[PDB]
Amino acid sequence: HMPVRYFIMKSSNLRNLEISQQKGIWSTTPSNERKLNRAFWESSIVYLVFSVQGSGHFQGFSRMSSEIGAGLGGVFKVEWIRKESLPFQFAHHLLNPWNDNKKVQISRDGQELEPLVGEQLLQLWERLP
């Protein structure tokens, strides 16, 4: 099995993203829930890169740290690694071959990143003050 897997998480608003960064939880659509549960069980690390739609930024990335279970439906534990915002221009050069070689910023919720492209994306956060 792949040791590390990378997924794009897309949020509709900044408010819920910042609550996630404080509380260490998230939830996604039921379309993604079984894909993510199996990546959690099969891989050593599941990385989740977050972006609010229409924000022009990635608002950080986390590790998936529990399975997915109204009433906080589908909530699961996340461990935030970097919370700083990364502008899209810094990642313009990264295309995802698993999504027709479109830019990683162009992504529906739950899109998986090819692992070598994912790691280049996470390393971009070392370029931030």
Positive or negative CA dihedral for 37, 50, 93, 46?
Answer: negative
Kindly list the distances between the CA atom of residue 47 and the CA atoms of 38, 50, 70, 71, 86, in Å, as whole numbers in the listed order.
13, 10, 26, 25, 16
Name the architecture of domain 4-129: Roll (3.10)
Locus of tokens 């990264």: 94
User: Which residues are annotated binding-site positions for RNA?
Assistant: 10-12, 26
Angstrom resolution of this structure: 2.3
Q: Which residues pair with 77 in a beta bridge?
A: 25
Q: Where are the domains of the chain?
A: 4-129
Q: CA 18, 48, 54: angle at the middle one, nearest 5?
A: 55
Per DSSP, which regions of 1-129 are E strands?
A: 4-11, 25-26, 45-52, 57-58, 61-64, 76-82, 86-87, 95-96, 102-103, 112-113
User: Which residues are annotated binding-site positions?
Assistant: 10-12, 26
